[model samples]
Target: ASLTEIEHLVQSVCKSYRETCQLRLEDLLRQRSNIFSREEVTGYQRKSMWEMWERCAHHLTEAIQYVVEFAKRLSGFMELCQNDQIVLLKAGAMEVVLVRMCRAYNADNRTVFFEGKYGGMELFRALGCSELISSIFDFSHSLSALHFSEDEIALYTALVLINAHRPGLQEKRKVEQLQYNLELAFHHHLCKTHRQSILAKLPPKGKLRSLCSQHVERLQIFQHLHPI
Candidate 1:
């Protein structure tokens, strides 16, 4: 398939699977509490929260895994050198996962729903987490204010995949061209601010230390699964 053809295929199929994690609402939360009122948290509650976090991290990592599987079948992606493909997937997977995770963003609550709930931002207070956890939610909430569409997300997916600065890429020009074209396509589709501000906010999610590289082991398995 041509780059455009592959782009369309990827955008169409992968968009729906963005939040395909199978954790139940109950499984995701220790005790179903008032989704409205603020509730106090204790060690007993936080223990389950830690379990939820582990499962969630695994699920979200799987979500990115399948998308990479879908990408590997595409001609544009298939045509890349093995090293370049590896480089792109390693760099781009986290980037796209973070962007799509914004779909789970709750503007009112200012949290990213791992399954179907938010908050617990304060639960980490006892843990060693810094402002990074809350900052991701803050960024998600801010991005939600713009209300990105699936097409917008997919268009931006191309931008995420065709990263220019990711080192060890063999086909820098090819990736750059792809990125430029994606920018051009989304530029026409996005409003003036869409390209300008929303995307600026989007990359911060990848900067998330915990969510990005730490989860790459499974993705590396996917990379070796097909040596294209």
Candidate 2:
């Protein structure tokens, strides 16, 4: 098969798998409180929250494993057409997001914070990448870095919406409300800010437009399974 054809096939398959996994994760998150209920938990009841988080790290590892596998297979198919450096950079960026999410989740777990300080310290040591963790905390402390431009924030909102799911009515509605709120917030920010102010630090509009067009072209190539 041609590279484009292979990419399209893989992209379709990967999208399906990602949607399935996202659905499963949404269901899990919806029942998160019950899932973590001390009374309901079975096996390793005595383990500290940090210890539990350490165990939970396996899930993130598994997620990364699957992502890497998919990337590798697709990379092989498009070896000639692919920008290897760009792929690597994208992969690294994704990893940073996951690492930040993991650390934020750990911080949100009160039990982990109180009882697992030592365990958390050890876990961080084992990860051997304190820089990522430190960056997460530093970002959390600095609101300035969180101030994304309207277009950038819209993209972020879209991602959150695309990823949202719920097992049933109530939870689904909750997420839907959040998605709506984010959309509104993005628009409000856009209206209140001067375009020049917001666009000043942004990539040149022409460059962004060109990159977006290129992305769409690549997606078309992948969707059609054409060899690049």
Candidate 3:
């Protein structure tokens, strides 16, 4: 019932950043790579270390800015009491930035693109990040392979931004209800994926018809129904 307003809101936000999102993957690739190429040895003392940190920092700052502006514009977000809106961002802003970066991941190359020079799992180690950054890179690689579109990405980000349990918030129930409503709305797009998957998996119709006639079909249904 309320789906229409939710869809329109999600779509508008999707398009607002849609053009920018499309263009940024190339931008990430255009950034230099292999920042750690100077040596296999790892330590913070290397003078080039600060430059790498700065570059990565630069990427995050720009991304967070866009997300903040977009978040403020969302109807669900704006309607929240000021306490919830402010608290929600404190807890969820970084999550949004990380999710957005998943869009530009280059899986085949085993690289995660950033606004500035890319290569550096070891780079984080130099900066005192242990497996922390490494794990995020691994997750992003897998996520990128899913080939999510901008609309899907937008809805996905929105679902995430609706943090249902921010610790300081006075509106816990409202936040949870908003999250539930969003899940129902996003479920609409999943129907396309569900049908496409079904079609891809189906056997040829003629063969399927013949196969349906086989006596083994009864046995199959017997097994299916009796599995418990």
Candidate 4:
């Protein structure tokens, strides 16, 4: 497909999937206690940190599911064999979800909007991983500063998934071919819509690797603290 055709397909799929299936922070918060209570809500005296961890775990699962649905709708994803598809999703879904977070982040006040509430670092304190949380917020702030339109996020996410070198790839060349075409589509779209510098700093994928490792480490820590 031509770049315009590719861009339109990716944008429409992303927009519809995000609207229908993406996990909103709002939905997660609503499933928990009221956001209005002052001390009780903020304090961990009544609620176990473990419970908060569980909620976050569930939230992450839902976010990954959205990525799965997104992959399903992409033009070239389904053409790949099942093993390659799984490998790509396993390696890249978290990165895509992290990219998606820029939408929920409130950069002006350094808060994340969850449900009917706007929460700063303190909101996620119960999870007890301050550094990871800070990195996430920082990443979100940087992305927010870039001011990427939804179409940009959609194409960027597609590039992330079509990565050709994630190890254990049965058809590496095929994926590379797919990735190159998607890159062309992304390049064409960005040329008309964004400046060169913005493209240079387009949501550093390197940072995401470290952040994801830290996130996994924290999950291990939380698991050890309360097994179940």
Query: Which ranges in model 3 have alpha carbons more than 4 Å from their true place?
Result: 19-45, 48-51, 115-120, 123-125, 193-228
lDDT of each: 0.57, 0.35, 0.58, 0.73
Ten residues in a row with the worst lDDT in model 1?
219-228
Residue 164 in candidate 4 has what lDDT?
A: 94
Cα lDDT tens digits, model 4, 1-228, are 765676776566557556644645456434333233457446643557788887777777777877888888776788998899988987888888788888777776676755455567777777777888898899889898987666677778888888998888999999998888777767776776655567788756677767776776677755532111
Error of 1 at 164 (Å): 2.8
Candidate 3's TM-score: 0.68
Candidate 1: Cα lDDT at 76: 61
lDDT of 4: 0.73
Error of 3 at 87 (Å): 1.3
Q: How does each model score on TM-score? A: 0.65, 0.30, 0.68, 0.83
Residue-by-residue lDDT tens digits, candidate 1, 24-94 = 22343342332423453454245554464555556756766766865664456778888998888876776
For model 2, the local distance difference test gives: 0.35
lDDT of 2 by residue, 77-155 (tens): 2242234323332323243233223222222332122122212333333333356445534333332343443234333
Error of 4 at 92 (Å): 0.7
Q: What is the lDDT for 69 in model 1?
A: 66
Best by lDDT: 4
Q: TM-score winner between 1 and 4, please give it.
A: 4
